[PDB]
Amino acid sequence: GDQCESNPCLNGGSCKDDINSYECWCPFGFEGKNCELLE
Amino acid sequence: NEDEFSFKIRRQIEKANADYKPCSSDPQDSDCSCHANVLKRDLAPYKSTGVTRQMIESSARYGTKYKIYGHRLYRDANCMFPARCEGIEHFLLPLVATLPDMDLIINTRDYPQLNAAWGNAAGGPVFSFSKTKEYRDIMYPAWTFWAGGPATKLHPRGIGRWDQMREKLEKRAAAIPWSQKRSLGFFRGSRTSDERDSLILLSRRNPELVEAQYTKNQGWKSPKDTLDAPAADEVSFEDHCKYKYLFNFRGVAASFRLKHLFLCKSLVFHVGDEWQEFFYDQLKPWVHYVPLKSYPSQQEYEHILSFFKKNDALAQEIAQRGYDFIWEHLRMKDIKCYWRKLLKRYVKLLQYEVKPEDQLIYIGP
Numbered sequence: 233g234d235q236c237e238s239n240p241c242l243n244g245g246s247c248k249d250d251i252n253s254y255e256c257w258c259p260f261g262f263e264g265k266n267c268e269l270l271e
Numbered sequence: 272n273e274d275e276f277s278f279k280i281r282r283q284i285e286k287a288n289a290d291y292k293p294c295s296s297d298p299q300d301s302d303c304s305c306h307a308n309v310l311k312r313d314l315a316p317y318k319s320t321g322v323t324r325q326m327i328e329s330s331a332r333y334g335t336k337y338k339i340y341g342h343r344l345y346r347d348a349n350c351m352f353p354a355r356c357e358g359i360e361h362f363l364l365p366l367v368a369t370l371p372d373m374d375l376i377i378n379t380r381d382y383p384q385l386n387a388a389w390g391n392a393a394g395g396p397v398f399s400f401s402k403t404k405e406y407r408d409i410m411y412p413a414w415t416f417w418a419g420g421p422a423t424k425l426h427p428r429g430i431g432r433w434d435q436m437r438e439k440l441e442k443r444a445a446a447i448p449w450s451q452k453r454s455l456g457f458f459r460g461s462r463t464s465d466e467r468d469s470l471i472l473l474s475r476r477n478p479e480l481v482e483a484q485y486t487k488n489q490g491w492k493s494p495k496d497t498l499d500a501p502a503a504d505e506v507s508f509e510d511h512c513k514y515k516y517l518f519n520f521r522g523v524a525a526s527f528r529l530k531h532l533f534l535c536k537s538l539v540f541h542v543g544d545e546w547q548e549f550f551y552d553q554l555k556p557w558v559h560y561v562p563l564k565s566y567p568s569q570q571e572y573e574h575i576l577s578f579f580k581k582n583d584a585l586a587q588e589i590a591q592r593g594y595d596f597i598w599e600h601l602r603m604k605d606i607k608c609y610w611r612k613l614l615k616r617y618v619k620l621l622q623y624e625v626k627p628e629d630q631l632i633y634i635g636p
């Protein structure tokens with residue numbers, strides 16, 4: 233998939249494309265599917 | 272050679288401007304009619320049969336289920352893009368008090384979902400930010416007008432707050448008037464579409480005509496994604512305003528870049544005519560911007576830039592009209608009223624009773 237191309241991961245997070253969806257890796261301090269939440 | 276080119280373009284300009292009628296009778300567009308053509312067309316294919324509960328249940332798999340039930344907002348627990356859902360909810364929430372019941376399948380993915388070359392498994396209705404004629408999706412104003420646009424180094428929480436952006440770009444456009452802007456083509460963005468390649472390759476061959484370089488996005492894989500050059504730095508929206516000639520391209524679907532370019536009072540070159548947002552129908556080629564066909568050649572870029580560089584007053588006139596259009600007809604109020612009008616006209620199409628669903632979470636207000 234190409235979901236990561238639009239930079240869905242906030243606050244310095246990094247992204248990995250699956251075939252289905254995508255997943256964010258969030259830096260320490262941020263949480264949520266898109267790193268949108270404070271830890 | 273240069274003369275045949277000129278005649279063609281001036282011919283296209285005069286024809287466009289002579290046929291141009293403003294999107295509303297008065298500039299204030301008090302009854303929210305500027306972008307009404309689009310919402311009519313999008314809803315039209317449902318006009319006769321309407322929307323069965325079965326159609327809603329059939330489409331639920333293509334997006335995020337929203338339910339307005341008795342002036343409260345309910346949603347699937349799982350938003351695929353939470354920050355995008357936040358953006359959408361900013362607009363839904365204040366309207367939920369004054370709005371009837373309805374189910375909304377709102378797709379928050381970049382690409383539309385209802386291919387009208389398939390069907391009738393792709394019958395809808397599904398809401399998407401961007402489409403072409405190939406798709407049945409109903410356009411809505413993108414989340415990013417409030418929140419959840421692409422996250423970048425300069426905008427780590429996602430490009431949003433179009434209200435604030437308008438004021439910031441208004442100030443910057445005032446500060447760098449036409450004659451002050453650099454006489455070069457400019458683009459800074461990532462390789463979300465290979466339609467973007469020829470401009471970047473021209474730039475490398477001729478930096479004195481075009482300054483265009485590839486940034487890196489979060490989907491980066493190989494150096495092919497920047498066509499084997501080191502990833503360039505991000506350039507702020509307001510720093511685009513120091514170039515006369517600003518390029519826009521589709522990405523996965525339409526790009527959020529476009530609207531920002533107009534508020535620089537620079538001349539916008541919009542490449543391709545397929546990928547839409549709700550407000551593109553009223554942006555008119557040659558009236559508000561310079562249209563270029565998909566996959567422009569380096570020779571096309573050279574000819575068109577050469578022309579406008581030698582026809583400055585004409586350039587500034589188009590730029591000024593594009594600016595004015597976005598200033599006057601892409602206000603927050605235009606976004607808010609489009610949303611309202613679209614939902615009101617849509618609810619009329621439902622041929623079933625909206626009933627609660629316990630698995631949905633309460634959103635607000």
Ligand SMILES: O=c1ccn([C@@H]2O[C@H](COP(=O)(O)OP(=O)(O)O)[C@@H](O)[C@H]2O)c(=O)[nH]1
Nearest residue numbers: 421459460461463505506522523526527528
């Ligand atoms: O240097 C840059 C690069 C990108 N962007 C913005 O970031 C978003 C993502 O741009 P990109 O080219 O990565 O992808 P697109 O969304 O255009 O496919 C768009 O709104 C761009 O206008 C920006 O403001 N400065």
